[PDB]
Design a protein around this ligand. Sequence first.
Ligand SMILES: *[C@@H]1O[C@H](CO)[C@@H](O[C@@H]2O[C@H](CO)[C@@H](O)[C@H](O)[C@H]2NC(C)=O)[C@H](O)[C@H]1NC(C)=O
Ligand SMILES: *[C@@H]1O[C@H](CO)[C@@H](O)[C@H](O)[C@H]1NC(C)=O
Lengths: 48, 48
Amino acid sequence: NFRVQPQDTVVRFPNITNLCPFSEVFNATTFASVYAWNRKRISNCVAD
Amino acid sequence: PTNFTISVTTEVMPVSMTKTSVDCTMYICGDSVECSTLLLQYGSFCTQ
Ligand SMILES: *[C@@H]1O[C@H](CO)[C@@H](O[C@@H]2O[C@H](CO)[C@@H](O)[C@H](O)[C@H]2NC(C)=O)[C@H](O)[C@H]1NC(C)=O
Ligand SMILES: *[C@@H]1O[C@H](CO)[C@@H](O)[C@H](O)[C@H]1NC(C)=O
């Protein structure tokens, strides 16, 4: 069947201006115990 | 018999059905070139 090759590339991501808190979750001063493990919500950030 | 009836009746007979053709690469793989590359091991079946 008649094929049409793509010519351009369209990238559409939501516009985010903030980096993800890597230092907050990887370089935190204290970590929780495993029985009381802490869960942190991650939103509106760029996962570089 | 002393009389007769001239009877016209219908008989419906199928003769042909729909002629169809299948493009294997568009069905199995669509427009992705990775699936088209992987489909090269199955070309004989599609020719069949
Ligand atoms: C994680 O946090 C510690 C503590 O703040 C950081 O260690 C400091 O690093 C700076 C920059 O190199 C030094 O000037 C300080 O002396 C260090 N100690 C303290 C007690 O502040 C560490 O760099 C952090 N890591 C990341 C990736 O952010
Ligand atoms: C045969 O039947 C027809 C009607 O179908 C009628 O008009 C005719 O008179 C009949 N003939 C006879 C009884 O010989």
